[PDB]
Design a protein around this ligand. Structure first.
Ligand SMILES: [Mg+2]
Lengths: 116, 513, 626
RNA sequence: AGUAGUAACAAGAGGUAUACCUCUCUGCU
């Protein structure tokens, strides 16, 4: 069972195998008393084990880079978002392929014009 | 062109995979490939005997018999916790410097109960050494007060090893060493002994559908609703969660989730010690202030689980106020002590009652702990019943039947049978009853329930086909009755469900005179 | 008052609230121990239905085989395997007559699909027996071991990568009387008989987690050499079954309800004032133990008539391999003693040559009845199929029987149509009087008895047309309620933060599409998934009063950043999902809401940590098993 | 003892040798 394995592996202190160059950006101790890495390795591959507080530490206090290519790199997901939010809805008529969980049900249906 | 030919070994194999009157694979291929039929089926159906026919016997529910229920001892309780008998020690809005750690909360709830008398036995386990249960409770009561830390692990005494059953598995040898014993035999594979239906499980299902004064399940947030089907869904879901939250079945859901989660964490984390596990639920009042309720303790055993059915034993000690000497067939497995006295100052009188402690040796497996961690599916599935009926009324009326279905403040739905007749309640009583049915289908789940439900669904659909003037009929109804009735052996929930089907069949008999 | 939920059926019909009779929230039953008793029960029950066949000693494998077909006609209502083969060829010819160009187009597209299939198509799928280990394995490992063992000996035709060349290697490898296989060490040498028995072996286990059975049953996994031929035969039968309108397989979802409403609209269209119409809902008893593989050989030789002969041989291999199969009997038994207080374990290969004073009554009877079938620890299983292998050819045979009953073909006072899926059937019969309906039921049942199809008299029922059930699709008056699949647990699957988020949202979306998940149930499923997600990854909301190992840095991240509605859930932000936006990944839904320092800290490529989703720092890789 | 139900768990694999030992942190208002 992989779900149960994840559930008892997240309960332990160090569940994440981070790459061995993590020691040059983020320290060992926290400001709140938590350890962010030991000096262990994984099963044969030299990746040092960390805590998820390292991930939250990177998210709140990491090195800010530039991310402007993501409207073009992962463009189809933002295309899904823009075709959702610029589209207007309609009534519930009791009686496209992407939103067929939304506008075609068991008994009902729903008018849905897309963006534009 | 492509090429494929058989080797001689596979050719000698292929000459023996034919209808019996042939001898070569190419000869059978030449017979098949140039076959021009001349009505062989008419000759076979004129030559086949006349015993082979599907004769129709017409169905009439005013003449069929009731399902039989077996005979034996009364059926006893088999839940992992006490359902309608458990007592909870409560702390209103805790702040005690542990604040969420379960042993700290168990100590904070234990310190709010003075009245520890000397523990004696008042209902013996039938097959047990009951002094070991008494000394297990005395050892746990001693070892709680001397704990320093976040987890309690118990010392491996003799009585604790008996109560968890350590050393009871016989040794595993090689076959060639011991094949010369007169006593050696196969593992015992008898069918289970039958049990007569008792009278407590109907009381459990009665009390598992009543409202309580706490708010058990607390769901998360959802996004900004825009579409009209999202507004219809929000209407349905908010009525259901408003009507179903304060019931006892939600308390049983939360208690089972917490117990199985803690048991799996202590099994996969500390798989060597006798780790004390407490039984905690956390709720709110109707005023919004938090409350921590403690029900009892669970002493784990060793857990070297490699399969999905390997069993970890545990000892469950749960407080209660129900004197077991009034329904003593219900507690054949337990061993009940009398450990305290409690003062009830209520609106009528101000009395004292003895507080008992229910001790038993239970066992569980990994798949049962996994499926007990997911009892919240009950809260899903009952909704997918009730909402489904709404759609089942929206396809014969062709309108949104959401609003004239929850604004029906009137006793419309039949849900019960009193000695006055069939009783009707509102739609909220139906929601609580269907949640209680899913919870008790998840607590008492076994194979006999699967066989009984899967084989009685056809009797329900045959009665429905009769009542629509569709003229039903079957081919072998005695076999259908036997296929249902073989799946009723000793589970209390299956016996109660067969009694419910018998009462439904008598009710639909009495409907049409 | 005593509460009774079945009294709910006094107000609504049973078809509306039938979902209360599905107890699918507790643990399904599992089997503790060996599957030897169940597999020996399967073998004994299979050889007791085809008892009046002809016993012939097989030349190559040496095992005692049994040939039920072309045998004596049955004379009871017990299940029998005696399928007359001229009736089978007649039904396939009538199915060819009713559909012109069907068999030729299916065979043409199968020949088009044969010469462009690579061998790694065998790597897909479930587990597979591995005769080099005598153990189930994944398909890739078993395929790699078989290719390596073939590469050591002189069989290297699969160097070109194709699949038909690997089948050539498989067929050629039965020549070798000296198959040497490295076993756990000592490289032992198989003889020709031992390798030929090891190639034709099905590995039998107990099917765990099944719904609706009190007593357990056995299933089997094929070998590695017999996977490719079964794949090609099932490809041909799949290409046929998608064009017969009376086939419930392999379509699903909303494209199955149209079939039920279509056959009800067809068969009840032009009914006169006398034209009665009835409907049998039916299950088939003993669907596995009665369809003989030689009937399937006659079927795949009649379907491929007129095709090139290499095609007929390649598709005829799989019934020839299946009519000589053996069955490995599992993992033995467990003996105990309470005097000396000790237990032992016996294997399957000791069953033919042990003293029978160690067993109970019934198991000793089973060993005495199966003792004359043993070949090197395996039991010969020539009659009958086992479950899961030929799932579309059986549907082809049932559709042939349903296609017998047209008005132009029968010229009687009755006719029928309907659907057949796997071993589940719904049959609609039109006639003029009720006795015509009875004679039509008799003609259908007697015709099914001529091909091995046994309708179960216990679990079938007939009424007038309008309400029926086909594979847990419940039809009432034009409304279909679907309860075929189990309502799954909407928990995490256990990859990482972002992967489990995207997998959960797409799973709720596809359940709303396929399995008729209502909108309010979908909203409660979103709530349950986010609750279990926030527990599993310890990533509860920022303004909470809980405490875990992450709540310190989650608290600081919550208090420091300004636009708090833009953080992801694994950063303790608010859940943004609802019904209209389950198909959008979470990073794109909060893009314009994120303050740019948070977004830049998120999607930096330079971090050492790194479903159709984005990649962030939450897309980490978990700790491997030590 | 107990879970459970047509057969299993109630520790197993080893070393010196009947006794020890290596391996196989848990907070769902
Ligand atoms: Mg059916």
């Amino acid at each position: 069972n992989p779900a149960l394995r994840m559930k008892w592996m997240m309960a332990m202190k160090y569940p994440i195998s981070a790459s061995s160059r993590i020691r040059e950006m983020i320290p060992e101790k926290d400001e709140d008393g938590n350890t962010l890495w030991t000096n262990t390795k994984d099963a044969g591959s030299n990746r040092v084990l960390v805590s998820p507080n390292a991930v939250t530490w990177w998210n709140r206090a990491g090195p800010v880079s530039d991310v402007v290519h993501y409207p073009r790199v992962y463009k189809m997901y933002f295309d899904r978002l823009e075709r959702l939010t610029h589209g207007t809805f309609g009534p519930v008529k009791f009686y496209y392929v992407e939103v067929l969980h939304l506008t075609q049900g068991t008994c009902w249906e729903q008018q849905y014009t897309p963006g534009g | 062109e492509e090429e494929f030919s058989y080797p001689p070994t596979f050719q000698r194999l292929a000459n023996q995979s034919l209808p019996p009157s042939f001898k070569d694979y190419h000869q059978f291929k030449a017979y098949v490939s140039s076959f021009k039929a001349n009505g062989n089926i008419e000759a076979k159906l004129g030559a086949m005997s006349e015993k082979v026919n599907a004769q129709i016997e017409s169905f009439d529910p005013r003449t069929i018999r009731e399902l039989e229920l077996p005979e034996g001892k009364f059926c006893t309780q088999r839940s992992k916790f006490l359902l309608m008998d458990a007592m909870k020690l409560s702390v209103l809005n805790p702040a005690h410097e542990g604040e969420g750690i379960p042993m700290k909360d168990a100590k904070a709830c234990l310190d709010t109960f003075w009245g520890w008398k000397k523990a004696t036995i008042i209902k013996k386990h039938e097959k047990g050494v009951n002094t070991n249960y008494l000394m297990i409770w005395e050892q746990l009561l001693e070892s709680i007060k001397e704990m320093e830390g976040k987890f309690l692990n118990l010392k491996k005494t003799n009585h604790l090893k008996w109560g968890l059953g350590e050393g009871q598995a016989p040794e595993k040898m090689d076959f060639e060493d011991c094949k010369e014993v007169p006593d050696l035999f196969q593992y015992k594979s008898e069918p289970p002994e039958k049990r007569k239906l008792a009278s407590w499980i109907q009381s459990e299902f009665n009390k598992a559908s009543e409202l309580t004064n706490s708010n058990w399940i607390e769901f998360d947030e959802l996004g900004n609703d825009v579409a009209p089907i999202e507004h219809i869904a929000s209407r349905r879901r908010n009525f259901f969660t408003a009507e179903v939250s304060q019931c006892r079945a939600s308390e049983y859901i939360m208690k089972a989730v917490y117990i199985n989660t803690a048991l799996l964490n202590s099994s996969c984390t500390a798989m060597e010690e006798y780790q004390v596990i407490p039984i905690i639920t956390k709720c709110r009042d109707t005023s919004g202030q938090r409350r921590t309720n403690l029900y009892g303790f669970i002493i784990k055993g060793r857990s070297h689980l490699r399969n999905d059915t390997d069993v970890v034993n545990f000892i469950s000690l749960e407080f209660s106020l129900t004197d077991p000497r009034n329904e003593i067939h219900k507690w054949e497995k337990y061993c009940v002590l009398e450990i305290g006295d409690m003062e009830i100052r209520t609106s009528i009188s101000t009395i004292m009652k003895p507080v008992y402690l229910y001790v038993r040796t239970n066992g569980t497996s990994k798949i049962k702990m996994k499926w007990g961690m997911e009892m919240r599916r009950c809260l899903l599935q009952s909704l997918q019943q009730v909402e489904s009926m709404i759609e089942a009324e929206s396809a014969v009326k062709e309108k949104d039947m959401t609003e004239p279905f929850f604004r029906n403040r009137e006793n419309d739905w039949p849900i019960g049978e009193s000695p006055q007749g069939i009783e009707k309640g509102t739609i909220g009583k139906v929601c609580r009853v269907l949640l209680a049915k899913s919870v008790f289908n998840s607590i008492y789940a076994s194979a006999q329930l699967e066989g009984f439900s899967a084989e009685s669904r056809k009797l329900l659909l045959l009665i429905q086909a009769f009542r629509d003037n569709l003229d039903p009929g079957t081919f072998d109804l005695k076999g259908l009755y036997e296929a249902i009735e073989e799946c009723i052996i000793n589970d209390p929930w299956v016996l109660l469900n067969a009694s419910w089907f018998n009462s439904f069949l008598k009710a639909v008999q009495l409907s049409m005179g | 008052m005593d509460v009774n939920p079945m009294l709910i059926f006094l107000k609504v019909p049973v078809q509306n609230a039938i979902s209360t009779t599905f107890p699918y929230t507790g643990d399904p039953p599992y089997s503790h121990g060996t599957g030897t008793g169940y597999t020996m029960d399967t073998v004994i029950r299979t050889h007791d239905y085809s008892s009046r066949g002809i016993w012939k000693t097989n030349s190559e494998t040496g095992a005692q085989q049994l040939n039920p077909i072309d045998g004596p006609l049955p004379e009871d209502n017990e299940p029998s395997g005696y399928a007359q083969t001229d009736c089978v060829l007649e039904l396939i010819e009538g199915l060819d007559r009713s559909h012109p160009g069907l068999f030729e187009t299916a065979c043409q597209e199968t020949i088009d699909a044969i010469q462009q299939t690579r061998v790694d198509k065998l790597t897909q799928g479930r587990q597979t027996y591995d005769w080099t280990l005598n153990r189930n394995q994944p398909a890739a490992t078993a395929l790699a071991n078989t290719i390596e063992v073939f590469r050591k000996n002189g069989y290297k035709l699969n160097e070109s990568g194709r699949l038909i060349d690997f089948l050539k290697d498989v067929l050629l490898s039965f020549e070798n009387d000296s198959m040497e296989v490295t076993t756990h060490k000592k490289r032992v040498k198989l003889t020709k008989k031992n390798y030929l028995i090891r190639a034709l072996t099905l590995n039998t286990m107990t099917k765990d987690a099944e719904r609706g059975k009190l007593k357990r049953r056995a299933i089997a996994t094929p070998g590695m050499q017999i996977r490719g031929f079964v794949y090609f035969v099932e490809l041909l039968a799949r290409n046929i079954c998608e064009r017969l309108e009376q086939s419930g397989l392999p379509v699903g979802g909303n494209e199955k309800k149209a079939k039920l409403a279509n056959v009800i609209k067809k068969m009840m269209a032009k009914s006169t004032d006398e034209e009665l119409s009835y409907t049998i809902t039916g299950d088939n008893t003993k669907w596995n133990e009665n369809q003989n593989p030689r009937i399937f050989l006659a079927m795949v030789l009649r379907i491929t008539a007129g095709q090139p002969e290499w095609f007929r041989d390649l598709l005829a291999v799989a019934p020839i391999m299946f009519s000589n199969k053996v069955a490995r009997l599992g993992r033995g038994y467990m003996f105990e003693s309470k005097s000396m207080h000790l237990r032992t374990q016996i294997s399957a290969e000791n069953l033919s040559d042990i003293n029978l004073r160690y067993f109970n009554e019934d198991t000793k009877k089973k060993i005495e009845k199966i003792r004359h079938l043993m070949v090197e620890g395996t039991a010969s299983l020539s009659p009958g199929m086992m479950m899961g292998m030929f799932n579309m050819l059986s549907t082809v045979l049932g559709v042939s029987v349903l296609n017998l009953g047209q008005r132009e073909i029968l010229k009687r006072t009755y006719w029928w149509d309907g659907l057949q899926s796997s071993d589940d059937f719904a049959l609609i019969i039109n006639g003029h009087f009720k006795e015509d309906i009875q004679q039509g039921v008799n003609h259908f049942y007697r015709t099914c008895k001529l091909v091995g199809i046994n309708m179960s008299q216990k679990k079938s029922y007939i009424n007038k047309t309008g309400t029926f059930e086909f594979t847990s699709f419940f039809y009432r008056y034009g409304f279909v309620a679907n309860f075929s699949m189990e309502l799954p647990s909407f928990g995490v699957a256990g990859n990482n933060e972002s992967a489990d988020m995207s997998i959960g949202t797409t799973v709720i979306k596809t359940n709303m599409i396929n399995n008729d998940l209502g909108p309010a149930t979908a909203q409660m499923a979103i709530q349950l998934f986010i609750k279990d997600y926030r527990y599993t990854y310890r990533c509860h909301r920022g303004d909470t009063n809980l405490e875990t190992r992450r709540t310190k840095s989650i608290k600081r991240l919550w208090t420091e950043t300004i636009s708090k509605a833009g953080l992801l859930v694994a950063d303790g932000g608010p859940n943004p999902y609802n019904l209209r936006n389950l198909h959008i990944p979470e990073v794109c839904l909060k893009w314009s809401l994120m303050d740019p320092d948070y977004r830049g800290r998120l999607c930096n490529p330079n971090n050492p940590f790194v479903y159709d989703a984005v990649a962030t720092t939450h897309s980490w890789t978990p700790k491997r098993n030590r």
